[PDB]
Amino acid sequence: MTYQALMFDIDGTLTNSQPAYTTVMREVLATYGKPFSPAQAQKTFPMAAEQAMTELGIAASEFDHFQAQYEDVMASHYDQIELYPGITSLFEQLPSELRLGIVTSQRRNELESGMRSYPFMMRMAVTISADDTPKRKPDPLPLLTALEKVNVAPQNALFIGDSVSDEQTAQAANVDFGLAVWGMDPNADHQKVAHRFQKPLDILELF
Numbered sequence: 001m002t003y004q005a006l007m008f009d010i011d012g013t014l015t016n017s018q019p020a021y022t023t024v025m026r027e028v029l030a031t032y033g034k035p036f037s038p039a040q041a042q043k044t045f046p047m048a049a050e051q052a053m054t055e056l057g058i059a060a061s062e063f064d065h066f067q068a069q070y071e072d073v074m075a076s077h078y079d080q081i082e083l084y085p086g087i088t089s090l091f092e093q094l095p096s097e098l099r100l101g102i103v104t105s106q107r108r109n110e111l112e113s114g115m116r117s118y119p120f121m122m123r124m125a126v127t128i129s130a131d132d133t134p135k136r137k138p139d140p141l142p143l144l145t146a147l148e149k150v151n152v153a154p155q156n157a158l159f160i161g162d163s164v165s166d167e168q169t170a171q172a173a174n175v176d177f178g179l180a181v182w183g184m185d186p187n188a189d190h191q192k193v194a195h196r197f198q199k200p201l202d203i204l205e206l207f
Contacts, residue, residue: 002206003176005099005125005152007143009161010106010115011045012183014087018045020080028069032058046163046185048105048136071110078114084182086200091120095207099150101126103142103159103169108132125150138168143175158194160203167191178203 011017018041025044026036034056044052049070053063094100100123104111108131115121126149128142135141147157159170162183170177176194197203 003098003158004156005101005147005150005158006094006178006203007101007103007146007157007159007175009159009163009166009180010102010104010111012162012185013160013180014083015081015114016084017081018042020074020077021045023080024070024073024077027073028066029056031069032062032066034058042186046165046188048138048165050136071107074110075113081114083118084200088120090200090203091123093201093204094123098207099125099152101128101146101150103128103137103146105130105137105165138165138172140169140173140175143169143173147173147175158206160197162188164188164191167193 008014011021022036022038022041025041029036040056044055047055049067050063053066058066102111102124104127106114106129108129111127111129126146128146130136133141133145143159144154147154154174158176158178159166159173160178160180161167162180162185164187167177167188178195178197179188179193180200181189181196181198182200195206
């Protein structure tokens with residue numbers, strides 16, 4: 001017996017977005033008088049925004065403005081973001097019986113502008129963005145909301161991503177986690193998970 005649903009994170013899993021993130025964050029951070037090293041980019045990329053801005057020492061009163069700037073600049077950089085190789089092939093081969101979806105911390109506007117053009121998005125049964133529930137990963141609510149919308153129980157779902165936040169979301173939700181090893185997150189790699197996928201097409205081995 002295998003899964004009825006696969007839910008995916010976007011950043012570091014479907015899209016190779018760390019380079020664009022790096023450029024955009026550096027640009028925002030300059031307006032707060034701060035540099036942004038490669039080390040800092042690697043460290044903060046997989047974090048929830050609230051954690052990352054805390055880690056970077058942003059004044060807590062400025063968080064909402066910082067995030068607005070980030071979203072504004074990022075909307076000019078989608079062409080700097082490509083899918084990981086194998087992702088398009090993966091979505092051609094996954095069984096049509098699956099309920100596929102997305103659970104992301106991206107705002108809806110960003111999700112739409114950045115993703116809506118990819119043909120594989122037509123296969124998504126549900127997309128949950130930051131705008132669709134009052135809680136954010138690693139709270140389980142966004143994952144559980146997605147699964148309720150496709151009528152699949154937590155035991156019959158796999159959440160595929162490459163962050164500790166995603167891992168904690170899944171654990172909290174009682175949903176199995178599938179590690180996208182190709183995202184190369186150092187911390188996510190050390191957690192015990194249900195499945196580890198070296199490359200995207202390895203997901204097909206579940207079916």
